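Table S5 (text form). Sequence records supplied for joint modeling of the six-component complex.
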Amino acid sequence: SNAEASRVYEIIVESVVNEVREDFENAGIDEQTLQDLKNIWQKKLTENLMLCLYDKVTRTKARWKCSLKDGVVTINRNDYTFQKAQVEAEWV
Amino acid sequence: GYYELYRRSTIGNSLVDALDTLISDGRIEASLAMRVLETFDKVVAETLKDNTQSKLTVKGNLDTYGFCDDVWTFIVKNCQVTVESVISVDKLRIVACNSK
Amino acid sequence: RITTLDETVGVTMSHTGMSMRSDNSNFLKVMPKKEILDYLFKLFDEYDYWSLKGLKERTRQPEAHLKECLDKVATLVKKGPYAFKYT
Amino acid sequence: SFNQFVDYTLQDIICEDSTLILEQLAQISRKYEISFGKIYVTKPMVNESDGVTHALYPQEARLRNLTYSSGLFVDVKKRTYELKYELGKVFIGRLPIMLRSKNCYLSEATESDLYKLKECP
Amino acid sequence: ASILIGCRRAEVARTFKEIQSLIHVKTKEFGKTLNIMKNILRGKSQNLTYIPRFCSHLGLPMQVTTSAEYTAKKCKEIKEIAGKSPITIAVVSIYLNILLFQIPITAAKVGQTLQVTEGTIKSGYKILYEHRDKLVDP
Amino acid sequence: SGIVPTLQNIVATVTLGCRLDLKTVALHARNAEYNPKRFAAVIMRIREPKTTALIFASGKMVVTGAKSEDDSKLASRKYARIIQKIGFAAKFTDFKIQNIVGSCDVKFPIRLEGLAFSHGTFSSYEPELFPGLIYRMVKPKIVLLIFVSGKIVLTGAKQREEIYQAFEAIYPVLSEFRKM
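The corresponding structure-token record, covering 718 residues in total, follows.
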């Protein structure tokens, strides 16, 4: 559970709708169609994978350290958002 | 610019299923969904770059590692994650690209 | 009048020659061949006359392959106003 | 005459032609400048072969066949212009010092002090 | 490397950081060229001198200079650490011989003048203070 | 005496006899590291034995990091078996050990200055540059590193008998320049 993820999701929905509204008016479809994109999108929004970027990956003998920045992690049906991360893994 | 790996997340797959739902079930114009995907990549990039304050800590046994086309891919078994709570993970996959 | 430094000399004389202290002041411190061929023909579409060094500064890649790609489809003019240029 | 030379002539020569500038061209213009300021004179000294530098007396100067001189330093100032956009005590050489002068050690010595330094009054 | 060789032949002492401060030779290639040059000299067929030089850099009396001489020789005879390059042995020897008297320089000034780490002169000052017993000349 | 040097590293080269492509190899493989902007070769590692092999596009591979000869040969056969498992027609041929590195301890301090003075034609001692001593033995041609604490390093050998003969030929010289 996290309210920051819901706030980020709301900023993403509002910003995407507001920035896409221009391309929706250029195509000439409908504004209520974009409203249906927001309603269906938020309706659909209601396997342990980390997505981010690395800054430095060092290895010493069999010890791996990684510096990660800005990413979302899916762990045990729970989502997380981090600005920094440190990975200290050991290889056989 | 703006990598397309964030599309593989939960919200990314949700937006992909929503766009494919609007294109398949209805008559929503195509190609525009790709523009929604690019705007999605930019918004997730800048949002995760500016609206994040957490700091994780993963410590486990490195099962697999690889690097290709500025892509680091790791597979860790039995790793503990510390948020800023401790979470036990049996298998964790990490995919990262170059930040520069 | 001129001021006479009264110190133990060895300090100033140490600062004269080698004193193991440098810097401290900034002053006067100062590939597939086919794709490369297609890109070269695109640069020819932009302009027919270009120097080989400028092409090496625009394409941004290993230069040996670019030279081999320039010695096949382009002729090198050495004199005239378009000297050292492939056309 | 020698004392007036050491007092005023050094500062006059250093100050009359100290400024030198290098003109650097790039294609944005650039410049550099070096100027000398207040010169500094020492007392008489001797730097030996091993590297030790100590005070010198005229007697030991005559016995060791040395040169009764004193070290000279100059405040060297450096500047870098980029074109009027503006962004050290260096040893210059030794100067032989005349005896019984304001720079030599014997000018302030007394009778018994000259007898200690083995110099006739 | 030729200047350093001419310095080693004339019984003179000049540290690698001094010629390195004069000429930027990138150290490593300097060490290789100095090694093969020494092989050339061998094919064509001493830290004590550093003490008076650094004592001249600090402006110390003669008693501290010869005291750092006896301290340098004795510390060369006691073993333990052996050296870790002779420069640090010289600076910790002068540091002990100057902490024996009353002339104050502290560790920061002598560390910024002689270009030596404070943690290194204190690390050597620890075991040196441990061997303070047999280093007394009078 | 009674001290026997223990091997620490073995560097061998194995020729596969084919050719590779590096994006596909780095894409389909498991434990490997590849980056053309730094080193144009795939760094493949295995767990048993814990070794490291540098694989090039011309088929040449460098297996290094083993503590014994059987671990370098068997590890090389494991790397070649992995290459044959990826999808190339490799062949484990031309296995030649290129380097053998060992170390030992004499359990007494060693006079490096007197050793560099007596054996000046074979030693190269510079404490301000390297606190150890570089002794270049003629027969056998072995490069030895002689430190102060007594740790003796031996490198530059093709067989183990060269290391053993180097230590047996350097032991009396170390016993001569002792301290306690």
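Note: The helical segments of chain E are 2-9, 16-22, 28-43, 50-58, 62-78, 86-100, 106-113, 118-130.
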